[PDB]
C-alpha cells in the first residue's frame, strides 16, 4: 500500500505499474475568470499532493472549527496511499478559454468518426480530465470526490467512469491481468522500465512543436460497450481465432508461452493482435492502461459491461488514430462497439512542491 | 482469510465476515417449469462450490471441445477465492410461480411505502438475488457474471448494483469501515461471534411459522442516494448532529471511545443513532450488511453517490419496517433518498455436496 511519488518531469499515473482500480472524472470548467482557473490549479496541485501521500487534505477531515465544513469529507481515514496516482488533463475544448487558442498543441488532434461508432455525447468529450489509480476503489474515489469539491464553482464533472479491474500492463515481469472476455490484456505494451521505448512513443519532446507540453503525453479514453452475450455464446476456437493468442496461456497462435513473439502471419488476418501490432502500422506503438467496467444491466435481461480503453501517446495522429483506422476489419468489432470517446492534453510533471499542474500552459 | 466455507446449517454471507467488495444482482424468472428452475439450483449450487473455492465452474474456462463455447468465462482465471461468498434469496413474486404461492413465508413482509420513498421500480424487486461479496470486485462480477449465463433462458438479470466498499461490519475487533458521508458505519451492530442475538435476530425458527426457512433469513435491500454536495457545505458541528456520534473517532457524543455504548438522551432527539436504537425500536435489532457506491453522475454536475444497504433479520416484520419507520424524521433524510428497494427469503445453508439452494422449499 506504498506511495507513488507525486513529483516528476514526468506526471505519474502513465509509465507507473498498473494500479488494480480507477477512478475517471471529465471536468467542464463554469468559470471565464484566468486567475480564478489559475488559482484552482494551485488548489488542487497541493490537494493531490496531501491526496496521494494518504493524508486528508487541507486541515484534514475532523478536529478543526465546529462551524467550518471539513477540509477533506473523510471517506479516506484509516486507509493507506494505496498507490494512488492523479493525472490531469486539458480537453481540446479548454483552448477555447482564458485565451490560450494558439496554445492548443497540433498533437491534441480530434479524432475522426469510426465504423460503428455510437457515441454518447454526455459521455465523452471534456474540458479537462482528472485519472484517478489506487488499489484501493474507495481511495480513489475520494480522491475524485475532494477535486470536484474544491472546484465547486469553477468547475463541474461531466462524466465519471469506475474501473474496477485493471485490463493493462506497464509490468511485464508480472502477472498480466484479463479482460472480461477472458484474455490476458497486456502483454505486448510499454514498461516502465523502457526509458527508450516511453521517450519514442509516449512523451511529446520540445521540437514536436509545442514547448509547454515538453515532458508531457495525449491521452485518448474510449468507453467500449462489450456485447457479452453474443461472445459467451462462441466456441473457444472463435474466441482464440478473434485475437490471435490462445486464451488459457495467452501465447501468440502456435506458440507456447504468452511472452513468446507473435509470428503474425499464423493468425488470422482480422485478428486483433495482427491488426494492432506495431509492425502492422509502421511501427506505431501504444502504452494502453484501460479497465474493465460494469454499470448495471441494459434493461434488457443482461449485464452492461465492457472495457474503459486509456492509450497514451507522442501525438495522437501517429498512436491511436492509425492503429484504430487499422481494426476496421477487426474481427472484435463483431463484439464490441464504442460508446464513448474524449481526447486530452496531459501536462508534464509537478517538477517540485512550488510547481502546479499546468504551470507551463498557464 | 483466503476463503469461506460454502456449505452450513446456514448460507455463508450473513453472519461470516464482510468481504470489502459487492457485486449484487436481481433476477427475474422466466421459466413456467418448476423442473427446470429445480435444475437450475442445482447447476447454480454446483457452479458456487466452484466459484467460492476460486475454481472455475463447469469443465473450466479453456481447455475444451475448441468447437465448443468454455463453460467459464476465464476472467477470473489467475485470481484467488477472495472470501466469495454467494447468497442467494427468494422474493415475494417467486412465490406466484411453480404453484408456491402458500409456501411464501409471513415474515417475508412486503415493505409499506415510506415518507420520501422515491422508488426507481427498475431497480426494485425481483424473484430472487444473487448478493456476491469478495475482497476482490472482479472475482465477484465473475461470479456473478457466470451465474447468469448459466441461467440464460430460465432467468434474467434485472438490476445490478457494484458495491466498491463496504460501510457494514460482523467482526468489531478490526477496524469499522467509513461511507461517504465519512462517518464509521458498522459499530453497533450483529457480529459473526454473538452465536444468540443471530439466533434472536437474524436467523428464522421452525416455530416462526415456516418450516422450509428454519435456518436461513430475511433481506432488506435498499439503494440509498446522499446528496453530497449539500453535505459537504454542512459544518463538521451539523454533521456530527446528524449522526449523534463525532465524525473522527466514531463516539457516542460524551464519550471518548467508538464502541462506548451511546447516551442516547445526549443526541439531538432527530440524530440518526438515536432513532434507529433498538432501545428506540421496541428491541428491533438490525444485521446490517451494505456498502458504498459511485454510477458516474447525476444529470447536473455532480456525482451520484450512495449506500446500497443490506439488512437481515428474522422477521421484516420485526426488524427493518419499525426502525425505518422511526426514520422519518431523522435528521439524516436531508441528505438522503431510498431510490430503490427489494426484499427476499434467504433461504437455509447448503449441508453438504449432495444439498442445492432451495432444495427445503422444492423438496
Ligand atoms: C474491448 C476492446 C478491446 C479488447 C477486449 C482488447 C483486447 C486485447 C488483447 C487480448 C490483446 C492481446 C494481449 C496484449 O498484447 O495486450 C490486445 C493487444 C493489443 N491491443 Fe487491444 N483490445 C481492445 C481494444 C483495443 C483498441 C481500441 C486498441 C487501439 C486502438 C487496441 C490496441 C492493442 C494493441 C496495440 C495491442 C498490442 C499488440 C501487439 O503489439 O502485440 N486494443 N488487446
Ligand atoms: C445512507 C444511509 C445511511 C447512512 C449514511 C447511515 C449511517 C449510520 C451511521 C454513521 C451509524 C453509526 C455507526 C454504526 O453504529 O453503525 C449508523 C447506525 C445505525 N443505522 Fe444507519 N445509516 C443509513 C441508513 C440506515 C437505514 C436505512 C437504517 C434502517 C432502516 C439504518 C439503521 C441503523 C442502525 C440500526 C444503526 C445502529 C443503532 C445502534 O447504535 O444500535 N441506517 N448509521
Ligand atoms: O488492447
Ligand atoms: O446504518
New binding site residues.
Given amino acids: 500500500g506504498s506511495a507513488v511519488p507525486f513529483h516528476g518531469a514526468h506526471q505519474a499515473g502513465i509509465a507507473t505499474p498498473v494500479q488494480d482500480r480507477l477512478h475517471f472524472a471529465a471536468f467542464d470548467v463554469t468559470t471565464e475568470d484566468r486567475a480564478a482557473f489559475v488559482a484552482l490549479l494551485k488548489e488542487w496541485t497541493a490537494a493531490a499532493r496531501r491526496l496521494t501521500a494518504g493524508h486528508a487534505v487541507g486541515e484534514g477531515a475532523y478536529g478543526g472549527l465546529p462551524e467550518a465544513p471539513p477540509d477533506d469529507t473523510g471517506e479516506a481515514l484509516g486507509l493507506k496511499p494505496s498507490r494512488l496516482t492523479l493525472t490531469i488533463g486539458f480537453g481540446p475544448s479548454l483552448f477555447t478559454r482564458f485565451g490560450l487558442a494558439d496554445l492548443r498543441p497540433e498533437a491534441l488532434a480530434d479524432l475522426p468518426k469510426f465504423p460503428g461508432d455510437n457515441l454518447d455525447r454526455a459521455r465523452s468529450g471534456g474540458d479537462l480530465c482528472v485519472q484517478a489509480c489506487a488499489d484501493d476503489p474507495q481511495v480513489a474515489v475520494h480522491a475524485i470526490r475532494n477535486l470536484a469539491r474544491i472546484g465547486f464553482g469553477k468547475v463541474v464533472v461531466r462524466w465519471s467512469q469506475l474501473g474496477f479491474g485493471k485490463?493493462?500492463?506497464t509490468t511485464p515481469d508480472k502477472q498480466?491481468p484479463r479482460?472480461?472476455?477472458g484474455?490476458?490484456?497486456?502483454?505486448?505494451?510499454i514498461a516502465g522500465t523502457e526509458k527508450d521505448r516511453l521517450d519514442r512513443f509516449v512523451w511529446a519532446a520540445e521540437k514536436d512543436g509545442t514547448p509547454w507540453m515538453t515532458g508531457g503525453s495525449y491521452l485518448v479514453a474510449?468507453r467500449?460497450r462489450?456485447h457479452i452475450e453474443t461472445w459467451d455464446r462462441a466456441s473457444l476456437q472463435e474466441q482464440e481465432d478473434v485475437?490471435?493468442?490462445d486464451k488459457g496461456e495467452?501465447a501468440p497462435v502456435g506458440k507456447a508461452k504468452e511472452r513468446d513473439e507473435?509470428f503474425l502471419k499464423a493468425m488470422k488476418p482480422d485478428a486483433?493482435?495482427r491488426l494492432?501490432?506495431?509492425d502492422s502500422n509502421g511501427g506505431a506503438?501504444?502504452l494502453?492502461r484501460g479497465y474493465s467496467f460494469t454499470d448495471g444491466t441494459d434493461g434488457l435481461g443482461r449485464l452492461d459491461a465492457?472495457?474503459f480503453?486509456l492509450?497514451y501517446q507522442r501525438d495522437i495522429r501517429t498512436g491511436?488514430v492509425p492503429?484504430?483506422r487499422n481494426?476496421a476489419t477487426d474481427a472484435?468489432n463483431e463484439f464490441?462497439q464504442?460508446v464513448g470517446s474524449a481526447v486530452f492534453a496531459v501536462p508534464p510533471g509537478v517538477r517540485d512542491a512550488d510547481d502546479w499542474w499546468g504551470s507551463t500552459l498557464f
Avoid: E, W, Y
Fill in positions: 485490463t493493462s500492463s498480466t479482460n472480461l472476455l484474455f490476458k490484456d497486456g502483454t505486448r505494451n474510449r467500449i462489450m485475437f490471435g493468442r495467452g507473435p486483433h493482435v494492432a501490432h506495431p506503438t501504444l494502453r465492457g472495457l480503453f492509450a491511436f492503429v484504430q481494426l472484435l464490441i464504442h
